[PDB]
């Protein structure tokens, strides 16, 4: 449906599965289903449903062996949601998780984009105690490549 | 309270109560609302025929039943006991007709039905009738509305309500009832008194109403009850 030039109703078709109750073989098929629900909801601009679905995924599962593309896509979706919502420290935290992901941490540009995003979304957040703590942490990351612009 | 003297019907409690007949009257008060109003030129009886489901064919068992061409009867209480009492009332009316070639007066029918209830409330192996009857007749040239209790006591009423919300019904009738009320207005008063204690939507086919004018007692058809409900609302 989504491929056939109509997503408004294709989102509804997919937004009916109770994958948490279905009982898949493991937490892989269900997680893929949930992330695709997320993607369709964001495509149709249904951020309330997107947030509700996000609360249905336990991030602790992403600290596993093959949960790398899943982690990357899930986070990218969270950044999209928070970018619409207007927040910036949550976007920072999501980009920082993306950076911490080893797959992102195995190529020059791949990790450099994540680190620039983390720096910029530290900067864009309002000044609070937590924001200052994150500023200090990113400053002490030591892997900033001393890029003459973001470092300064 | 007097706990020992509440299982038998042939013993006075130390204070003189006959507790079991009062318990029968409690069974009466825990029944479907019914209302009776004695208009100036007739009488009207109403009672909720609300069923416990849509499956109950609400056209087979009636609650407002005739006993003669000029007497009818409704009840509040248990339906089986009501059936027994209506059969006995019909039999008594027929006996009176055979003896005296004249329709039984409403007062006499009430006396005899109360006597039947007394017969049933005077032994240990028999349970008092757990119903209160409202009899409405057009003997002579004036209307009669009577009540008969399990105890065998019978009353003459201007207007009354019995069942679950009889207190509210009687207060409403005190507010609304006036002696010089035509039967057409009394029907509206009866239906309104029912509404004040009728949960759910009072559809034409879940309420039962019977009038008693000089033409004789007659249970209003559901079409007529629908017309009255529409006019009232």
């Amino acid at each position: 449906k989504e491929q056939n030039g109509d997503v408004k109703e294709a989102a509804s078709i997919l937004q009916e599965l109770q994958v948490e109750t279905y009982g898949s073989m493991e937490k892989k098929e269900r997680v893929e289903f949930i992330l695709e629900q997320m993607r369709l909801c964001l495509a149709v601009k249904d951020y309330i449903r997107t947030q509700i679905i996000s609360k249905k995924i336990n991030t602790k599962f992403f600290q596993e062996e093959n949960t790398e593309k899943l982690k990357l896509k899930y986070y990218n979706l969270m950044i999209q949601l928070d970018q619409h919502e207007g927040s910036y420290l949550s976007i920072c935290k999501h980009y920082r998780a993306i950076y911490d992901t080893p797959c992102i941490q195995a190529e020059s540009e791949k990790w450099q984009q994540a680190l620039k995003s983390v720096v910029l979304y530290v900067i864009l957040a309002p000044f609070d105690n937590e924001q200052s703590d994150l500023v200090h942490r990113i400053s002490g990351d030591k892997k900033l490549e001393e890029i003459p612009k973001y470092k300064d | 309270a007097e706990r020992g003297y509440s299982f038998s019907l042939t013993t006075f409690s130390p204070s003189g109560k006959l507790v079991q007949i009062e318990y029968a009257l409690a069974a009466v008060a825990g029944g479907a609302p019914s209302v009776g109003i004695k208009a100036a030129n007739g009488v009207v009886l109403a009672t909720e025929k609300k069923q416990k489901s849509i499956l109950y064919d609400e056209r087979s068992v009636h609650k407002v039943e005739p006993i003669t061409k000029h007497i009818g009867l409704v009840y509040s209480g248990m339906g089986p006991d009501y059936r027994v009492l209506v059969h006995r009332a019909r039999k008594l009316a027929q006996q009176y007709y055979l003896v005296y070639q004249e329709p039984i007066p409403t007062a006499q029918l009430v006396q005899r039905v109360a006597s039947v209830m007394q017969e049933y409330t005077q032994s240990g192996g028999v349970r008092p009738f757990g119903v209160s009857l409202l009899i409405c007749g057009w003997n002579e040239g004036r209307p009669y509305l009577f009540q008969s209790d399990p105890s065998g006591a019978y009353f003459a009423w201007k207007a009354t309500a019995m069942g679950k919300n009889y207190v509210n019904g009687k207060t409403f009738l005190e507010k609304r009832y006036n002696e010089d009320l035509e039967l057409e207005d009394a029907i509206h008063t009866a239906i309104l008194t029912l509404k004040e204690s009728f949960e759910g939507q009072m559809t034409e086919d879940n309420i039962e109403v019977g009038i008693c004018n000089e033409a004789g007692f007659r249970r209003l058809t559901p079409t007529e009850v629908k017309d009255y409900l529409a006019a009232i609302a």
Partner: protein, 241 residues
């Protein structure tokens, strides 16, 4: 209030008959269930049939009785009480036909049985026999008729009813199915009854573990459907459902 409990004739301080209520509990004691539904021009009773032994003659085991040529009943509850009340119903129908010269109306037979039961509920001579009788017949002026004769003198007429363990579930199912096009045909009524039993019991029926009796306007004689007819109904209606 437990003192007002051992005698059928004692009113509880709030006006309740605990022994009558216990008779109803006795209805819900045979384990079986029964359902009845009336269409435009037919009435159908279907009863769960348990034969938990190879030595028990299934032909003799039954809960559908022919009260008269044109009236049938399904009994649920204690079997001895069921058969006693069936004999009483047959006797009353025979007396009616003898005295008045025409076949007893179904509603009249139900009223007679309900009055007989009310007598026991009022006087203290017997226990109220704990069985529920669902009667079906064809009335010449009204059409198909289904009635109940519970053991307290209550006998309301029904568009569709159930009795036994799962009477509440069957009642809910039939309410839902009758709010939508209560107008049923013969096949549709048999479908509705059998489906109600199957869904409430959570089982699909073999042709033998079910007993169906039917009356129709065209053929107003209580007929107990044979195994072949039951199997035909089950297979055809499950296939075309």
């Amino acid at each position: 209030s437990a003192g007002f409990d051992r005698h059928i004739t004692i009113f509880s301080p709030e006006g309740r008959l605990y022994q009558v209520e216990y008779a109803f509990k006795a209805i819900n004691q045979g384990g079986l269930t029964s359902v009845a539904v009336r269409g435009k021009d037919c009435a159908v009773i279907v009863t769960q049939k348990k034969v938990p032994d190879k030595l028990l003659d299934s032909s003799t085991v039954t809960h559908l009785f022919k009260i008269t040529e044109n009236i049938g009943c399904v009994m649920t509850g204690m079997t001895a009480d069921s058969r006693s009340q069936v004999q009483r119903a047959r006797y009353e129908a025979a007396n009616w036909k003898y005295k008045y010269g025409y076949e007893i109306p179904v509603d009249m037979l139900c009223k007679r049985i309900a009055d007989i039961s009310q007598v026991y509920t009022q006087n203290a001579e017997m226990r109220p026999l704990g069985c529920c009788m669902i009667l079906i017949g064809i009335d010449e002026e009204q059409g198909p008729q289904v009635y109940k004769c519970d053991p307290a003198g209550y006998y309301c007429g029904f568009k569709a009813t159930a009795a036994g363990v799962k009477q509440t579930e069957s009642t809910s199912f039939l309410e839902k199915k009758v709010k939508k096009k209560f107008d049923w045909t013969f096949e549709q009524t048999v479908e509705t009854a059998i489906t109600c039993l199957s869904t409430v019991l959570s089982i699909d029926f073999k042709p033998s573990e079910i007993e169906v009796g039917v009356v129709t306007v065209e053929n107003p004689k209580f007929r107990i459907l044979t195994e072949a007819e039951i199997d035909a109904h089950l297979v055809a209606l499950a296939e075309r459902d």
